[PDB]
Design a protein around this ligand. Structure first.
Ligand SMILES: C[Se][C@@H]1O[C@H](CO)[C@@H](O)[C@H](O)[C@H]1NC(C)=O
Ligand SMILES: C[Se][C@@H]1O[C@H](CO)[C@@H](O)[C@H](O)[C@H]1NC(C)=O
Ligand SMILES: C[Se][C@@H]1O[C@H](CO)[C@@H](O)[C@H](O)[C@H]1NC(C)=O
Ligand SMILES: C[Se][C@@H]1O[C@H](CO)[C@@H](O)[C@H](O)[C@H]1NC(C)=O
Ligand SMILES: C[Se][C@@H]1O[C@H](CO)[C@@H](O)[C@H](O)[C@H]1NC(C)=O
Ligand SMILES: [Ca+2]
Ligand SMILES: [Ca+2]
Length: 400
């Protein structure tokens, strides 16, 4: 499946891939390299709660390739600017980080976790991640001109910003290719319409175009607290479609192929509020689990993990419980135990990793959307080793 950057998952992972694990702990940054030797390595004495005063409430911490060598660097939007530790290539990183731009920060430009969104993305096909922010007046970009040189921020589009009424408690904003040129476009679930804005590839987006009168707070009664929405390729043409977990179950609107969108249809009477699914209890994801390389549905429910496989065209097979674990009944909690659907093995069929109370656990896809046994990875990066959602940030990420 394709590169989509979302609020929930701001660090995309590759399909196929062998993702690593990265934790911003109280003491700094730690990695678990996906390899024959599984261990935790501390790489940076910074970007932590007690290593630089980093706070989930004020600061943003991401991974992105900022040089074009396909190795992920550590990027932090700190108190007064953007800080970067680059990947040295050998399971080490530059420490300390350097400040590349005095903007996109709590005390540089007045950026706020409660009002604004900050991502890193290669928006101009340079091979390097630019800084992209949904701020007050619209979307701002700072161009990554290479050699650690980031240009002053410029307005990319006067839309999708706080000034245009966009709110984190009502609306959703994504970056995803909806046209097929490989450039990430804006997809925004607004007050009463889904909008797209076409990336021109030059640090600007085209005027926003309304494409769907649904999936929004004021179009079908879609709420942030009950009804998660995602953007993903459901058909295999590498153009993103829309999928929402609504009241009756799963609704889609399929891309016509040019970034306009078709009718909204209920495609599966499961994974929705009426089947007992709750944002506070459960995790719902779309990722490629099969050799069809299309979005399949995965839900971490009460009794375990449930999967519905896409036939290749956006229609879905029966729901099956594939793993009797990682579920609310087994003690897993949204507010304690991060769970990700990510390729860990390199076959293109996403696997499961969960940061449990005591250990990190994985479960491998057999290659067909069914799963083997649960595997212990390590006894670290967990609640009992001092990791909480309030004070730490954890990701699956392809470091290399
Ligand atoms: C006075 Se901000 C503080 O600066 C030091 C370097 O002086 C840096 O090590 C920290 O990471 C940074 N923390 C944040 C949150 O920005
Ligand atoms: C790239 Se900072 C951005 O700068 C413009 C002018 O440059 C200012 O009006 C914005 O309010 C400020 N902050 C945010 C959060 O959008
Ligand atoms: C009256 Se809603 C408002 O409409 C205008 C015009 O279409 C659009 O440019 C804004 O982005 C949209 N804002 C949200 C939050 O939906
Ligand atoms: C009163 Se539910 C509402 O039903 C209509 C069709 O009746 C559908 O278009 C909406 O998308 C759906 N909203 C959610 C959140 O499920
Ligand atoms: C009483 Se849990 C329930 O089990 C059925 C199958 O028995 C499954 O199809 C549902 O989607 C699942 N819901 C949740 C929240 O896990
Ligand atoms: Ca595009
Ligand atoms: Ca796999």
């Amino acid at each position: 499946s394709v590169v989509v950057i979302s609020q929930a998952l701001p660090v995309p992972t590759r399909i196929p891939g062998v993702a690593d694990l990265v934790g911003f702990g109280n003491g700094g940054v730690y990695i678990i390299r996906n390899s024959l030797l599984i261990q935790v390595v501390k790489v940076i004495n910074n970007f932590g709660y007690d290593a630089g005063g980093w706070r989930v409430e004020k600061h943003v911490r991401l991974l992105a390739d900022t040089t074009g060598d396909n190795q992920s660097d550590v990027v932090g939007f700190g108190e007064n600017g953007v800080w970067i530790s680059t990947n040295n290539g050998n399971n080490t990183f530059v420490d300390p980080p350097k400040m590349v731009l005095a903007n996109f920060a709590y005390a540089a430009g007045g950026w706020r976790v409660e009002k604004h969104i900050r991502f890193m993305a290669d928006l101009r096909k340079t091979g390097r991640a630019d800084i992209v922010g949904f701020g007050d007046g619209g979307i701002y970009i700072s161009r990554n001109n290479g050699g650690g040189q980031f240009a002053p921020a410029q307005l990319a589009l006067n839309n999708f910003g706080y000034a245009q009424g966009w709110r984190l408690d009502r609306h959703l904003r994504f970056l995803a290719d909806v046209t097929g040129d490989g450039l990430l476009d804006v997809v925004g679930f607004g007050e009463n319409q889904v909008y797209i804005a076409r990336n021109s590839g030059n640090g600007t987006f085209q005027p926003a175009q309304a494409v769907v009168n649904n999936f929004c707070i004021g179009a079908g009664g879609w709420t942030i607290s009950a009804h998660p929405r995602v953007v993903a390729d459901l058909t295999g043409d590498r153009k993103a479609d829309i999928l929402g977990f609504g009241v009756a179950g799963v609704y889609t609107s399929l891309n016509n192929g040019n970034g306009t969108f078709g009718a909204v249809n209920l495609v599966l009477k499961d994974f929705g509020v009426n089947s007992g699914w709750r944002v506070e209890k459960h995790v719902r994801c779309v990722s490629s689990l099969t050799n069809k390389k299309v979005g399949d549905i995965i839900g971490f429910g009460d009794a375990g993990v449930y999967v519905a496989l896409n036939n290749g065209n956006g229609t879905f097979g029966p729901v099956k419980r594939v793993i009797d674990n990682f579920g609310y009944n087994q003690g897993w909690r949204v507010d304690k135990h991060p769970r990700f659907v990510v390729d860990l093995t390199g076959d293109g069929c996403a696997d499961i990793v969960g940061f449990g109370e005591n250990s990190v656990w994985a479960c491998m896809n057999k290659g067909d959307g069914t799963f083997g046994p649960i595997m212990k990875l390590i006894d670290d990066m967990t609640v009992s080793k001092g990791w909480t959602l309030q004070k730490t940030v954890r990701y699956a990420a392809n470091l290399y």
